């Protein structure tokens, strides 16, 4: 689903500013 | 910066990742930012692959009709640099994996407009300091 990808991208984006 | 500058930057970025043979002259500032964005999206993808096994492929098979839903949902609760980079990475993916590299088609223009409108509408340049 496009919705799952959306959660994964948000998780990655949030952890991106960090890690 | 200028809304026109960002519209110009987005198109330039998409054409570059699409490997468009014809070089549409842009300021050095624009190219520099295109370079920075490509590098960021690759770092971003690197993190995505470390955390998840899945590719963007499956979910982006209906991009021409759901990409907008994806962008709204990507910034539904907040906006930060990381999500914006993911935003461009989704674009790089479409140009590199879905669409064919080397030509700038109507589908590209569809992608370009979708990204350009959402970026500007949502004031993304305000949360995306290329320093």
Author numbering:
A (entry chain C): 106 to 124
B (entry chain A): 5 to 135
List sentences from the manuscript:
In this study, we determined the structure of M11 in complex with a 50-residue Beclin1 fragment containing its BH3-like domain. The protein in complex with Beclin1(101–150) was crystallized and its structure was determined to 2.3 Å resolution. Residues 106–124 of Beclin1 form an α-helix and bind M11 at an extended hydrophobic surface cleft corresponding to the BH3-binding groove of BCL-XL. Residues 53–55, a loop segment tailing from α2 in free M11, form an additional helical turn of α2 in Beclin1(101–150)-bound M11. Another notable difference is that the bound Beclin1 helix interacts tightly with the α3 helix of M11, while it interacts poorly with the corresponding region in BCL-XL, which consistently exhibits poor electron density and high temperature factors. As a result of these and other differences in the binding interactions, the M11–Beclin1 helix makes 88 intermolecular carbon-carbon contacts (distance < 4.2 Å), while the BCL-XL–Beclin1 helix makes 76 such contacts, indicating that the marked difference in the binding affinity arises from the difference in the shape complementarity, and thus the quality, of the hydrophobic interactions.
The BCL-2 family proteins, which are commonly known as positive or negative regulators of apoptosis, are characterized as containing up to four conserved stretches of amino acids, known as BCL-2 homology (BH) domains. The interactions between such proapoptotic BCL-2 family members and the antiapoptotic members, such as BCL-2 and BCL-XL, are the crucial events in controlling or promoting apoptosis. In addition to their critical roles in the regulation of apoptosis, the BCL-2 family proteins have emerged as regulators of autophagy, a catabolic process that plays crucial roles in cell survival, tumor suppression, and innate immune defense against intracellular pathogens by degrading cytoplasmic components through lysosomal pathway.
